Ligand SMILES: Nc1nc2ccn(CCCCc3csc(C(=O)N[C@@H](CCC(=O)O)C(=O)O)c3F)c2c(=O)[nH]1
């Protein structure tokens with residue numbers, strides 16, 4: 039044994055599973071708004087010798103030695119993080135060590151708040167994320183709701199937009215220390231101007247969770263929340279098309295004596311990440327992020343992202359011109375909130391049938407009473423150089439599924455079994471999927487060819 | 490743009506950085522007890538297309554769909570995890586989604602304890618880990634000390650061993666709900682049976698954090714904490730020699746005919762997701778499964794046996810050159826060197842060894858409370874490079890020269906910053922450092938190295 043043997047030679051059971059997933063990604067249509075396809079250049083760094091480096095601390099202030107190279111890699115990933123969103127190194131700093139999106143959020147709460155301090159984030163069935171402080175009416179779900187006290191602000195069931203007035207009303211009754219301006223299922227764009235005015239009034243921190251829209255924000259297509267938020271957190275995948283990791287952007291520098299009142303985010307944010315919450319950084323993921331961050335500064339990524347919104351807008355209209363209602367009436371980002379029960383069926387039903395024909399989406403609760411819609415995502419297939427005509431065949435493929443969906447019971451377990459057990463329906467199953475797989479494989483696929 | 494362009498063409502600046510780090514690991518004498526060299530097979534999975542799949546949830550119970558393949562991978566990583574540590578699936582379960590070791594421990598505390606519940610681990614300067622509840626006299630440092638209330642137990646300064654007597658004394662006063670049996674800088678075997686007696690008395694969960702010794706435990710070269718612990722957490726790197734990830738093992742099944750059942754599974758799994766983490770890192774999970782498969786082979790047992798021999802040989806060699814060892818020696822993979830009887834501190838010795846391509850870390854000794862007077866040295870890294878006992882005796886000789894160099898520079902320097910700046914701006918010592926560094930790098934480069942050849 040040397041440690042240099044190939045994966046296909048040493049672990050053939052795992053190699054087959056790698057290819058089964060590589061084939062599944064190639065053969066299907068990916069419409070989960072949070073997923074993408076990482077470049078091969080980043081994956082080469084993700085699976086590199088940087089995994090063998092314990093570098094606890096930060097460049098300059100590391101717990102031990104040997105960090106000659108990973109310091110430059112962390113600093114380069116920091117330099118590339120501020121470039122990808124155009125930020126002055128005197129007004130903004132970045133922490134590239136968070137393991138993922140959820141760790142990056144909990145690191146901000148630990149840094150700026152005390153245990154049981156008050157948190158305000160958009161509710162989960164209304165389009166917010168778990169880490170925004172989601173607890174149900176029976177349990178505290180996210181640990182962000184355990185170690186901190188969270189009250190959600192809901193969607194206006196009329197416009198489908200954020201009830202920016204009910205928020206300001208409750209924000210003075212709740213008196214939170216931080217409010218999260220970010221979403222996981224929301225087609226419109228966040229009015230960061232209202233969020234900052236609400237925050238600056240009740241004297242709360244404005245945190246922008248731009249994980250879903252980080253790529254779009256980098257390409258300067260949608261308004262950047264860096265003009266209003268003191269703290270900006272994001273994943274490095276979703277639309278940024280990078281390895282799974284996280285980032286924390288924070289204000290830096292100087293925010294009646296005549297003495298400058300300085301920003302106090304850097305030292306606290308860095309200390310909460312290490313040594314408070316995390317141990318050794320994942321330097322392989324850090325370098326892979328720097329690779330994908332450099333790709334975001336390129337004109338190609340802007341042309342890519344501009345194609346995502348066109349693919350999302352053309353998908354939205356292609357849904358519309360068939361008789362589909364869109365929550366908020368349309369899309370201005372990368373994903374469409376399809377309101378499905380005006381057509382006669384819900385989300386949990388549509389998402390299963392689409393999955394069986396190699397079309398991946400997620401049910402999402404729409405303003406209503408079993409969820410009533412889907413969250414269809416452009417950025418995944420857009421990275422396969424999809425175009426407006428291609429997504430129109432995707433929506434026509436999705437929609438042959440929903441038309442089966444309206445024809446496929448009573449319960450959801452019957453709906454489930456009737457999909458695969460009904461022999462006559464089971465043969466239309468292989469029919470629709472075979473042409474979806476035949477249509478999807480023809481497009482290119484980023485990353486390695488084999489795995 | 491295809492997304493299939495190589496890194497060498499797409500980002501030459503990053504590619505040059507990857508090669509510089511690769512040369513540093515190849516040319517250096519890696520002695521950090523927590524570091525290892527991951528195999529190429531696991532690294533192929535770590536940087537694979539599994540990064541693309543969101544599989545929030547668990548096999549069977551997924552929040553989306555299309556996770557049919559990553560369900561088989563995650564289920565396989567669990568089976569290999571139980572087989573690597575010879576665990577009955579009816580008696581033990583395992584969660585394979587913790588992003589690292591620290592998230593694994595925080596998930597266990599969140600799963601089993603209410604906020605501000607009480608925790609007891611080995612104090613950090615005494616050899617415990619940050620995530621075992623460390624806080625200083627002035628500041629809460631680890632989040633283990635903020636969301637929960639921790640009180641440490643200490644070593645016996647006479648023997649260098651864990652004071653199990655004082656632990657039992659203070660545990661009855663403090664009444665912890667969970668005690669951590671695990672170390673980051675401890676050369677001896679932990680009396681898990683005695684830890685279990687203390688936990689059984691004060692009615693506390695016994696958590697075994699076997700991160701540093703997980704490889705030794707899997708190869709059955711040292712006693713297993715699974716024999717006495719309720720929860721076992723570990724990193725997947727270090728002696729397991731995998732990618733950076735975490736694992737949470739837990740009891741399951743059955744603990745007037747009323748058989749009390751184990752209630753760890755659902756609480757542990759809920760704390761990982763949806764409480765603390767989001768989407769699993771399926772690429773890291775597969776790399777862990779590859780390494781766990783490697784840990785079941787006779788080769789891995791021979792590797793772990795060699796790690797014990799190399800550590801003891803490094804310990805015996807240090808004793809011959811007139812060095813002191815905390816607890817008098819070692820029974821595992823690392824050695825705690827006490828440098829105070831020779832006149833140098835671990836802070837100065839760490840920088841000197843770093844400039845001759847010998848990476849170690851300063852370590853507090855039983856006594857100071859003060860710049861550290863000791864050094865932690867590990868065997869697993871170089872042993873993976875096929876180092877043997879004579880090679881480590883040679884490794885000590887290079888270390889002994891660095892210490893003698895550090896002694897000479899301290900006699901010509903004042904503060905610590907004047908010491909570090911002297912090795913870089915004094916030609917007579919700089920020239921003598923370049924000769925030892927070159928003589929060390931030549932020795933290190935000759936040995937094989939796991940992973941890819943160029944990155
Ligand atoms: N809008 C929006 N859409 C999406 C789509 C994916 N995500 C991220 C993942 C969310 C996962 C999640 C949220 S709530 C919950 C839950 O309570 N699950 C069990 C609890 C018991 C158990 O886990 O056994 C239940 O009570 O059934 C979850 F599992 C989001 C998001 O954050 N927001």
Ligand SMILES: Nc1nc2ccn(CCCCc3csc(C(=O)N[C@@H](CCC(=O)O)C(=O)O)c3F)c2c(=O)[nH]1
Nearest residue numbers: 094101309312313613614615616617618619630673674
């Ligand atoms: N025995 C043992 N050996 C090792 C070797 C590596 N580790 C794990 C990493 C330990 C890191 C760490 C421990 S204490 C501390 C700290 O408080 N540092 C600043 C705070 C301000 C700042 O960091 O910005 C200070 O208060 O001056 C740290 F950062 C361990 C371990 O856990 N135990």
Ligand SMILES: Cc1ncc(COP(=O)(O)O)c(CNCC(=O)O)c1O
Nearest residue numbers: 317318523589590591618672673700
């Ligand atoms: C017992 C223990 N637990 C957790 C960790 C760290 O977990 P991460 O993978 O999240 O870093 C360490 C390594 N601590 C550093 C060292 O011993 O050198 C450790 O020794």
Ligand SMILES: *Cc1c(COP(=O)(O)O)cnc(C)c1O
Nearest residue numbers: 138139140167247249250767768
């Ligand atoms: C996806 C997402 C997360 C979760 O990220 P993980 O990498 O799964 O921890 C958090 N916040 C937002 C806004 C997201 O879109």
